[PDB]
Design a protein around this nucleic acid. Structure first.
Lengths: 143, 49
RNA sequence: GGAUAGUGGCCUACCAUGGUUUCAACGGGUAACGGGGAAUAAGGGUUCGAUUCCGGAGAGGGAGCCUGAGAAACGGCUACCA
RNA sequence: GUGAAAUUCUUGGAUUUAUUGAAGACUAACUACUGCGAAAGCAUUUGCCAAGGACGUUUUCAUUAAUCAAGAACGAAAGUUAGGGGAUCGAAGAUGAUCAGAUACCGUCGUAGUCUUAACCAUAAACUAUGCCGACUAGGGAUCGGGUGGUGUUUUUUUAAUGACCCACUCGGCACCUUACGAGAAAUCAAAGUCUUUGGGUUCUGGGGGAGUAUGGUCGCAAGGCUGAAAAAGGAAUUGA
């Protein structure tokens, strides 16, 4: 008879059994304990904040290669160094040194011809203004 | 030649239940009363920090 | 018996030794004010409801009182911590 | 005694032979796809003590039932404690031979054990690699226990048994052979089935392999604390110069 009780008074058993097994689930346990965001890429947040340490690939030759677009920033709520993209070597110029960049996830959908893997972050705001804003010449980077 | 099939013996630790109770306190008990609200407030608070 | 607007271990005497509990009491947690309602799924359910109305509680934190039909009030008072 | 040997024991006669005696285990052939039991398990004879299934029943009570945590009973072999006995085999150990080949890695002796009583231990590939109770859903023979019937042989007849075989029927078993209008990825399954997507009752349980890594997730386990050495044809050679 399918393993579970079925009698019209057995609701206490059906309910209590469900509670224990619901705990045995995994998304559920994490949701109630508060750990999904300890799994998340960089903590709770959706953007993180970092300091530009050094620009990698300054000396590479072919322009607009991934190792040109990359930089290296240390996340400030950990003191933890991670590398990050930046479109447009021009924008590589817009970001220089000790700049307080605002990083976001990369969320790439498909690989490219020479994309560096294992580089999951992209720079969004630099010293408080938008990289696309600077690049489009709407704004100007305030020192 | 002979093909002597082997047999598995028994499990060691693959249980969500014992994994919950394996730390001293009952991680099941020390929980909250509104998981969705926790989620969105932790979101918002982490961003503000 | 005292007290109260008045019921009542409410409190005080003097008596009995009871009361709740696997139908989960007691304890711990709660990013818990409760409900009308909001979102959404075909149903079953699930999650949200600090937030326009209803109720409760609070006016930095303990406690205490005066007036008055109505306050343990804080745009009233008294002392204590901050 | 081995493949080959060897320690060993043998003029106080061994191995062998005859007649006996003691000691402790053990119960051969008969032994089967047969029996019994809750499983582990259980084979010589007779006796006693209780117990059990099945079958037969025109006996009796009248729902007393099923599933079930806690706990309890028992639980092969090995093992532990204390006694007893101690023939046999025999972890450790002591020894022989280390002979090529392990194709043919053993021999002699033997503590503990094996056996027994009284306690512990509670584990096995403890297997039919599959929780239990109930019901229905395919044919076929054989076989073990009981009962009913039939028929002739085997039997025997006023004494104490009146059992064997054959045949049909029959409940209940150990299994088997064919197949599934079913199920399944397949092997297979009479349950692992019960007409397309699902309710006969009930308990427990669930949300691969190697690798590579981080460890504050945690538990174990270590040392010393007077102590030190300085390049070669300046070859090969019964094969050379």
């Amino acid at each position: 008879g399918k393993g579970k009780p079925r009698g019209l008074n057995s609701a206490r058993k059906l309910r209590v059994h469900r509670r224990n097994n619901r705990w045995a689930e995994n998304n559920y346990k994490k949701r109630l304990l508060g750990t999904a965001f300890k799994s998340s890429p960089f903590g709770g947040s959706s953007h993180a904040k970092g300091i530009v340490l050094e620009k990698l690939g300054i000396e590479s030759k072919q322009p607009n290669s991934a190792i040109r677009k990359c930089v290296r920033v240390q996340l400030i709520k950990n003191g933890k160094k991670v590398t990050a993209f930046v479109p447009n070597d021009g924008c590589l110029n817009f970001v220089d040194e000790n700049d307080e960049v605002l990083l976001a996830g990369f969320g790439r959908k498909g690989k490219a011809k020479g994309d560096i893997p294992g580089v999951r972050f992209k720079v969004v705001k630099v010293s408080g203004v938008s990289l696309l804003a600077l690049w489009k010449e709407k704004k100007e980077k305030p020192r | 030649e002979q093909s002597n099939k082997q047999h598995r013996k028994a499990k060691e630790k693959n249980t969500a239940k014992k994994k919950l109770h394996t730390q001293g306190h009952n991680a099941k008990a020390f929980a909250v009363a509104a998981p969705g609200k926790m989620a969105r407030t932790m979101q918002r608070s982490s961003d503000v920090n």
